[PDB]
Amino acid sequence: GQPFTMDSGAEATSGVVGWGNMDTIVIRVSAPEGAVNSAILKAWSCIEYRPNPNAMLYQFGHDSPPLDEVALQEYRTVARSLPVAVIAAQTASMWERVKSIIKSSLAAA
Amino acid sequence: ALTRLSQPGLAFLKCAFAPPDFNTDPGKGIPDRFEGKVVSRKDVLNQSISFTAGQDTFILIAPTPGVAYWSASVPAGTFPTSATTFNPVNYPGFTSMFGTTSTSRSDQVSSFRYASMNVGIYPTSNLMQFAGSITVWKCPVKLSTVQFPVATDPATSSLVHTLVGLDGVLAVGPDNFSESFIKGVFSQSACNEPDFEFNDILEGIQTLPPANVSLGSTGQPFTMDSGAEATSGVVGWGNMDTIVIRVSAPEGAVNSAILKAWSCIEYRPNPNAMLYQFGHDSPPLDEVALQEYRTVARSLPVAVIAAQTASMWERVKSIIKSSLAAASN
Amino acid sequence: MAALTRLSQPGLAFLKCAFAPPDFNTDPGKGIPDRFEGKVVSRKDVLNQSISFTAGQDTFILIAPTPGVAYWSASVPAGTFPTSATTFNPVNYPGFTSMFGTTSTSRSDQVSSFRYASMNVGIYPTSNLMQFAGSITVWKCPVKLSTVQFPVATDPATSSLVHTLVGLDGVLAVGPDNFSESFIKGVFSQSACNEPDFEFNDILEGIQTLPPANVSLGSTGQPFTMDSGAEATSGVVGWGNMDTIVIRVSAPEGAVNSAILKAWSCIEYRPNPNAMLYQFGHDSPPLDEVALQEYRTVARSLPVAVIAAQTASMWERVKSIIKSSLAAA
Amino acid sequence: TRLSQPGLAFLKCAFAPPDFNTDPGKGIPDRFEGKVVSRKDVLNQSISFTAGQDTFILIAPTPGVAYWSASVPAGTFPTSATTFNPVNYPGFTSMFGTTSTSRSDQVSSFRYASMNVGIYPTSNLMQFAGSITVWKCPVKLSTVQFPVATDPATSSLVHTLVGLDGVLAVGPDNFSESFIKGVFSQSACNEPDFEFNDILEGIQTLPPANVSLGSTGQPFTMDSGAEATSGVVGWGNMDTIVIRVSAPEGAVNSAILKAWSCIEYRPNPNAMLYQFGHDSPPLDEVALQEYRTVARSLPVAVIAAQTASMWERVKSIIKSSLAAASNI
Amino acid sequence: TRLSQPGLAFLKCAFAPPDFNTDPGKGIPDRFEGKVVSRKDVLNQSISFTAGQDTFILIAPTPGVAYWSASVPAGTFPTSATTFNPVNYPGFTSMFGTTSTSRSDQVSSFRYASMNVGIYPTSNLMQFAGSITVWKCPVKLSTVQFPVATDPATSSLVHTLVGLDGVLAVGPDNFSESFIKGVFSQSACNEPDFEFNDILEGIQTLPPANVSLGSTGQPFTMDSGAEATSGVVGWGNMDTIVIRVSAPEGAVNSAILKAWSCIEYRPNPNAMLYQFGHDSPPLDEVALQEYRTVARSLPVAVIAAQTASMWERVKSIIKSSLAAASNI
Amino acid sequence: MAALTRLSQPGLAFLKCAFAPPDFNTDPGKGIPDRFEGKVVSRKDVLNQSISFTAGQDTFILIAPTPGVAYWSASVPAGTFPTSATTFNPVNYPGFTSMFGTTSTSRSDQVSSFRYASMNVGIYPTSNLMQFAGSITVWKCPVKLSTVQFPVATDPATSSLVHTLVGLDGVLAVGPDNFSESFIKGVFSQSACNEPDFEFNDILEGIQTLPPANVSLGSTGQPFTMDSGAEATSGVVGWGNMDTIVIRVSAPEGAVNSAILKAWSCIEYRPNPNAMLYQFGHDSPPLDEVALQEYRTVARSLPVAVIAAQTASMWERVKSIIKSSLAAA
RNA sequence: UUUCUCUUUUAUCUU
RNA sequence: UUUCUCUUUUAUCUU
RNA sequence: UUUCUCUUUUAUCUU
Numbered sequence A: 001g002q003p004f005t006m007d008s009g010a011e012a013t014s015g016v017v018g019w020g021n022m023d024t025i026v027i028r029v030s031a032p033e034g035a036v037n038s039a040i041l042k043a044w045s046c047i048e049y050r051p052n053p054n055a056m057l058y059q060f061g062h063d064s065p066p067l068d069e070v071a072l073q074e075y076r077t078v079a080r081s082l083p084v085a086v087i088a089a090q091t092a093s094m095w096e097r098v099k100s101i102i103k104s105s106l107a108a109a
Numbered sequence B: 001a002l003t004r005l006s007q008p009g010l011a012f013l014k015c016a017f018a019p020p021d022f023n024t025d026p027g028k029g030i031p032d033r034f035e036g037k038v039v040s041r042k043d044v045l046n047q048s049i050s051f052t053a054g055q056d057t058f059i060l061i062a063p064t065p066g067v068a069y070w071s072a073s074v075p076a077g078t079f080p081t082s083a084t085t086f087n088p089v090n091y092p093g094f095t096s097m098f099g100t101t102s103t104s105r106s107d108q109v110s111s112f113r114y115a116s117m118n119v120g121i122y123p124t125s126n127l128m129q130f131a132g133s134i135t136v137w138k139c140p141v142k143l144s145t146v147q148f149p150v151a152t153d154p155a156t157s158s159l160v161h162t163l164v165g166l167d168g169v170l171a172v173g174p175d176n177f178s179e180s181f182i183k184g185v186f187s188q189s190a191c192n193e194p195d196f197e198f199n200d201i202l203e204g205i206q207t208l209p210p211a212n213v214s215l216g217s218t219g220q221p222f223t224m225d226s227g228a229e230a231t232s233g234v235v236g237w238g239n240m241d242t243i244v245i246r247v248s249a250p251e252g253a254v255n256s257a258i259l260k261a262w263s264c265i266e267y268r269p270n271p272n273a274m275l276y277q278f279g280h281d282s283p284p285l286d287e288v289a290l291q292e293y294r295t296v297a298r299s300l301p302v303a304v305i306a307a308q309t310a311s312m313w314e315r316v317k318s319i320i321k322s323s324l325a326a327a328s329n
Numbered sequence C, F: 001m002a003a004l005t006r007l008s009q010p011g012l013a014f015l016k017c018a019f020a021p022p023d024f025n026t027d028p029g030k031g032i033p034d035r036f037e038g039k040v041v042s043r044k045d046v047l048n049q050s051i052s053f054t055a056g057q058d059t060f061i062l063i064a065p066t067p068g069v070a071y072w073s074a075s076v077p078a079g080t081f082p083t084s085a086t087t088f089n090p091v092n093y094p095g096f097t098s099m100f101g102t103t104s105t106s107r108s109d110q111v112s113s114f115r116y117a118s119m120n121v122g123i124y125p126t127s128n129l130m131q132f133a134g135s136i137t138v139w140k141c142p143v144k145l146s147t148v149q150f151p152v153a154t155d156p157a158t159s160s161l162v163h164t165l166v167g168l169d170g171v172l173a174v175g176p177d178n179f180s181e182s183f184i185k186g187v188f189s190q191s192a193c194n195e196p197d198f199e200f201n202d203i204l205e206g207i208q209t210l211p212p213a214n215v216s217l218g219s220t221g222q223p224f225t226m227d228s229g230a231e232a233t234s235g236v237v238g239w240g241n242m243d244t245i246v247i248r249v250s251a252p253e254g255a256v257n258s259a260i261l262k263a264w265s266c267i268e269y270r271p272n273p274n275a276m277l278y279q280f281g282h283d284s285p286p287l288d289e290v291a292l293q294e295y296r297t298v299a300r301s302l303p304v305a306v307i308a309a310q311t312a313s314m315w316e317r318v319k320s321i322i323k324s325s326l327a328a329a
Numbered sequence D, E: 001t002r003l004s005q006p007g008l009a010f011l012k013c014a015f016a017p018p019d020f021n022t023d024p025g026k027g028i029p030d031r032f033e034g035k036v037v038s039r040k041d042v043l044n045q046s047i048s049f050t051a052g053q054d055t056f057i058l059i060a061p062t063p064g065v066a067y068w069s070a071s072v073p074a075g076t077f078p079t080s081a082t083t084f085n086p087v088n089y090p091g092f093t094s095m096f097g098t099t100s101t102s103r104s105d106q107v108s109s110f111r112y113a114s115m116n117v118g119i120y121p122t123s124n125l126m127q128f129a130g131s132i133t134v135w136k137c138p139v140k141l142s143t144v145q146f147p148v149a150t151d152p153a154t155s156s157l158v159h160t161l162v163g164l165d166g167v168l169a170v171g172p173d174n175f176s177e178s179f180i181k182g183v184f185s186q187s188a189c190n191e192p193d194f195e196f197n198d199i200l201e202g203i204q205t206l207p208p209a210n211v212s213l214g215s216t217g218q219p220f221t222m223d224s225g226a227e228a229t230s231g232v233v234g235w236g237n238m239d240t241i242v243i244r245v246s247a248p249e250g251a252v253n254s255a256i257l258k259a260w261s262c263i264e265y266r267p268n269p270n271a272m273l274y275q276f277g278h279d280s281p282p283l284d285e286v287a288l289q290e291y292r293t294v295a296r297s298l299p300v301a302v303i304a305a306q307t308a309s310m311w312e313r314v315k316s317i318i319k320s321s322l323a324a325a326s327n328i
Numbered sequence G, H, I: 001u002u003u004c005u006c007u008u009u010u011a012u013c014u015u
């Protein structure tokens, strides 16, 4: 039923280790004929893993943070509030745009 | 002043002449005498599109449900010929309403009627590479039929769907908007009838002329091919004039852009459809809005540059208040 | 009140032929009060029929805007809906032949076109309290008569086009907006113009079956079939602008469900100067803005159907809605 | 309230005599205000009626064609063995080309506003004989569905005019008077609104080519002939006027026939006619209800004598109903 | 006060020209509001008058029959040796079957509202000769009682038309003018109220079969002929119009005759006509006294020229009496 | 305001066809509101033309009151003006032939006379910001069509008389009253009746060149020549009462100047009873004192030309001047 | 089809 | 296309 | 992300 295919290639270089609970961001980038479109692409991922006692990874582990009712409801609000995407320009103005939405909805409470 | 319009009657005028990027429920419906159950479908297309140099690309905003526009390119300085075929670009979820076979369109809905049909072209190329123009006019394209005989055994007479008025695309209408490509454009169409009558959903249509029909028998100047019955098709023809857009890209010109299309359509849902869940009664008659609609439409320019897409709603309100003023005297 | 005095005699009669019970409405009214005032012939069709339902079988009844035919029925296995294997047979109003002849090509001999005003139906149980069983479900489908286009491998190869009933698929599911009570409680319901205005429809020649002769159900998209039978007894003379009333009547095994079935139809025809009908014609009623807006309101206001019990209380329920909405104006 | 300039003009093109330099006007005052081109079609036809014949002239809402004429032996009406031939308005070809597929080349659709007709006897007073009779028919263009035993077997659907059977008899609502007295009559929109009808391609005959008159139900035939001189470009929503000029034996019946037609067409941007186009007049409720009233009030037809006292008949009705409604 | 829609329509069907697309209307505005079916019967008859003959046309309140015609030598009137033959309105059979006992099959009773007649000369201006004369007769359908020597001896009672002797002379109150000028005339209810009359079964001739014209008193005979083509279905309460077209020798008198008839019938539940039925209009005192007044005021008949200036004659009288009564 | 309500529908339309942009004016108006009310045919001529300018050459465009021809052009050496060695070639409005035949002696076949109402023109640059160069200068000349008288040494000797364009000499200098901005900024300008009233002008037969065939430029005084070419494609059918718009477009060497050129013409003709044109005619609009004085004022008030940019802002700029001068009255 | 308050809770029109 | 004062500085109409 | 009125116009909570 999948409309297209996903190939990670040589098992020795890449592969599909799992599938998280985050909607998938889709991006169409139209390049006309004779157009030079050069850019830098960045990607963030805050992931929390369960380290295997054997892994040379484990020594960097710690305990998950305690429940923060506030932060969780803020997260949800900010999330649903923010726009699909913004222009690269206001990437820095982002943190601020956020801090705004927080005080705005935490004020009406 | 704009308080003489019913809530919907106003909403109606907005879905109509303004690009409601604003997330209202998509339109209320039409403030006409009809108040039966309908579903206001707000169709919207966002298509990135690069224009090939040395070609005069033609785009048709037709009142064909489920399809935002049809295009094809002809060599620069020329228009479509018999040798031309237009391919449709569907709004999202075409199949989700009309199925995947030319005989399953009337499955979800039975009839329809357009309310708005807007389109905008927003240039994305730089100021050193673009070149060319965007020309726009509107054609009274209706969907009739052609009657001709066939030498079969026994010999018989045929009758098939044929598009009348297409010949209007072979020339730049006098009533037109023409300006530099880079300036983009926004334009909308309106009901080419005195009222908002419903049209039936058409089964089986995939091409015009229809398969097995020689072009010219119909008298059409070119062809319409929706392609695979499982991906697109022609489900009906609304009572809106078709919008013609000629984008001539000179040689070596990098003209890219983003095209947007809006369509408020009232469909009559079928009880067996899930879609039916979102049906409501059509808005009650709003004599004022119906009289304004007509006035606003007649006033507005053929089209305007992309920039004035915003000032659109405002331009409208002023035309209205200006009309409601003369009504007091 | 001050609402019943704003209406013209015609305007009032109109509203009665539309929602009033058959007995109260002794006067069909001079017709439809609208812009049209040409020569017409008002004919109030009424069918009374003692019918007994087949036990262990659900019987479906379709009321459609077809001139000279009250309804169409078909029985299917209990708990099921029509299938491709299903075919509906029409029951004619008295004197169908005296109106549309006896040959599929002599329908337009008496009248050329028509337009429906009211189209009601009622079921009055006559079973005793020791024999009744089952339920009566009712919903309405927006069935319209369109056309389908497809190619044919003949010699030479050609493209066809024939009549198709669009939105018939709605009959295969009980839409959320429905009436549904125990058989014994009967049911009463009407239908109204599914168009903003009352436009005339042409009389259709040669139509006997749908899909028509030599056409596979497959190529039409219609979920089931319509057969009027011998051209000499019945047939499909046209298709009006009224949503179609659908009725599922479940009869359990060993249940005696006897009832009387009634049907109303206020139709306005265009008499042919030659017809022995013409001498009964008169001019269509003048426009009655009020009556028209009342009609629309009452229509959208009334419930899908009501139990047979409150068939008489109907006229009153109506007269209520009128003063209620004409008071807030 | 009062009428608009266009709303008044509209009522004149509608029932006004054409000798009044009638203004096509800007068109029809209704909700529609779209671009359109107004055409005032006028035909003057000198014509002699065959003695011992009953000539039948039909005014139909067929664009570019003034009328269809056929003749049958005195005392009879058209039969299956009859075929009506159209007389085109001036410049038919300049509008709908010369092919049965060149109609929609200049205009895509249309709608009629008026459709009048007049017959002015030119015979002396002893030579003439016979009578003129008029009635109108609600002839509409439908479709017929019948099967055909081809390989493989198929079903055929085609155009068929309904309500023609009304021409085979003299409608009760009719005008009937001596030939010499002439006649004038007009038709009106047979629909509640003035909707647009499309232009029709390929129609040259009805029954069409390869169809028996039996398959259609139509009582007789319609032939426009050479697709290069005439044809059926569409069927409007106007009742069709029927005129039966009964000429007896040894009767010299000569006369002139005029045909009026106010039509609003939707011009194709590419057509030359587009420059002439303007916008349909704004809705004028008054005129739209006057039109409807005047129409219902006027007689089927009148002798050619009262062709000038026509406009005054109307002005009278206009203020006689603008009077029963002006009091309260 | 003013008239109702039906009360106005009623006055039009009554004296209004039929070229006005006259509305049958809902019927008669009187105390009665019962279910009925309005029928507007119209006949157009092309007819040539025998030279040296005096043709007598009688408009009688016989349903389904436009008129009865008989001819006698110029200068004479009908005699015992005369028989009048009826010309039926269209679809006579569709209403009263094909048996002398199938009349009451569709409708049980009836009552006339209007009964007009017109004659429109189609002759040229030198060929024609003669004159048209009109007067009306209070012909009513009674009964005659005479004994018959059978075994045993018995008494016989049968229908007999009274007041026919009035056709054997030209009533003083009459219209008389040149043939060519044509003529138009109408009749009115000869009773104070519009009561219903029953449909009559078995009547084909008067005197009936087996009765001598001597037994009836009737001056001449009435024959409808084949019970399968015509017959006498009833006699209404309208005075009978008499028209004497006097054609001399070598006179070519051709013309068209029209006959109007607004009738209200009580439909049988089983009849197809029942669907078309509505309720008689509510009593409209105004119209009922206007009808009565207009009637008495109007002339016996008028030349066919003033057939259109008829409606205006009425509108005039309507407000000229609504004026002598509007002051105080 | 109270100014826009004093005008008749015609009076308003008139003012728009005159100064309004081509897109806003979808309705040409019933014509000129003045004393004349006879039968006429309003024809709004519109030319759209993609034109590229020759580099290193100044191109001159002349807009004249000639029926069926939009403009006349000719290119000359940069920095220079026309000379005796110069000849202007006309560009026809669509369907010139369908109006004035194909032979210099069949111009008055469709129409006998005419009179101009509006005569606008606009230039919309389509070059990118890396390729445009040059300037657009505009002024107006009072060119009128007169006659010249001179003797001829024939046998016997005779005196001639032929058409001459008077005041053509004005095209050889940029008058103090002028528009003149960078090419890229485009330009928009109209022209108006150079007479106190709108008198009709006759259609002129046989005119193909000026100086005409067999006449030396010397004997006419005209500074340069006018050649319409093949009588079968173009020609000079008459000369209206509108000042002629002159346009100098300087294109530097190596500069890519591409633009769209538009032209308006509201002309009122006297249709010949025979013409297949006549059926579109109507009566001239009634006198509208207001509209006429407004016209004059607006005209004299508006600037020579404006940049292409404010072509839309035009209609508004106008509506301003009206209320301003109609307020002080 | 009945009666209002109350806060709702969205939604535009206006500064 | 916007707002007035001020003196401008010509210019006629009126005694 | 900013400011209120106004009528909106739906929507429940309560008598």
Ligand SMILES: [Ca+2]
Pocket (backbone or CB within 6 Å): A001, A002, A003
């Ligand atoms: Ca899938």
Ligand SMILES: [Ca+2]
Pocket (backbone or CB within 6 Å): B195, B197, C197, C199, D193, D195
């Ligand atoms: Ca309609």
Ligand SMILES: [Ca+2]
Pocket (backbone or CB within 6 Å): B167, B218, B219, B220, B221, D101, D102, D103, D104, D105
């Ligand atoms: Ca074509």
Ligand SMILES: [Ca+2]
Pocket (backbone or CB within 6 Å): B103, B104, B105, B106, B107, C169, C220, C221, C222, C223
């Ligand atoms: Ca289907």
Ligand SMILES: [Ca+2]
Pocket (backbone or CB within 6 Å): C105, C106, C107, C108, C109, D165, D216, D217, D218, D219
């Ligand atoms: Ca038939």
Ligand SMILES: [Ca+2]
Pocket (backbone or CB within 6 Å): E165, E216, E217, E218, E219
């Ligand atoms: Ca006697």
Ligand SMILES: [Ca+2]
Pocket (backbone or CB within 6 Å): F169, F220, F221, F222, F223
């Ligand atoms: Ca000079």
Ligand SMILES: [Cl-]
Pocket (backbone or CB within 6 Å): C048, C049, C050
């Ligand atoms: Cl029964």
Ligand SMILES: [Cl-]
Pocket (backbone or CB within 6 Å): B172, F048, F049, F050
């Ligand atoms: Cl171009």
